[PDB]
Amino acid sequence: NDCIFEVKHEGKVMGYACLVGDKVMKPAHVKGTIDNADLAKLAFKRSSKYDLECAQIPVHMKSDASKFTHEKPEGYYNWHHGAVQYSGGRFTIPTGAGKPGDSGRPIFDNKGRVVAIVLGGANEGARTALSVVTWNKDIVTKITPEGAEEW
């Protein structure tokens, strides 16, 4: 646990599902079992257009929390499978670093703050762009390269 949190359901690892402050996300295409099975007894909220189901973190994960940001730099960011070249409003990974089953992985910055959450990819050959949802100072926006797929 550098910053490592999970999601897995019925014998297939559904990627990750993390905690941002008071929020536990779930990407709306992920269905099933939480990595922390005390969290499945809480009501989620569906945003199919924004592709999420959100839930309110109780008090007993206050010491388990993690930090995020609202600002956006330009450049390169670390994540668990490697690097992301974010340029021009586009997140790009080396081809094959993602896969279907990498769903709900966060992206943390060069400081550790959660900057976005993955939803899927879109291959451009030598790299592969990334369809995500971020926040942009008081709103979320679904930032999506077209032709996306469920990862």
């Binding site: 929020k23 909220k45 945003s47 959100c54 995020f68 609202h70 008081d138 709103i139």
Partner: protein, 52 residues
Amino acid sequence: SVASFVLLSMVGTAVGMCVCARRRCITPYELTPGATVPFLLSLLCCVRTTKA
């Protein structure tokens, strides 16, 4: 009696737009962090008006 039913349907559509507006009130700020209604729950007063 069916005029009573039609007006009951009309206020059913009134609570229908109310509940669709409530879900669309939370679609900006489900738990989208920042955790703030800048003026929306103070003016609009949609639902759960006890957040700062």
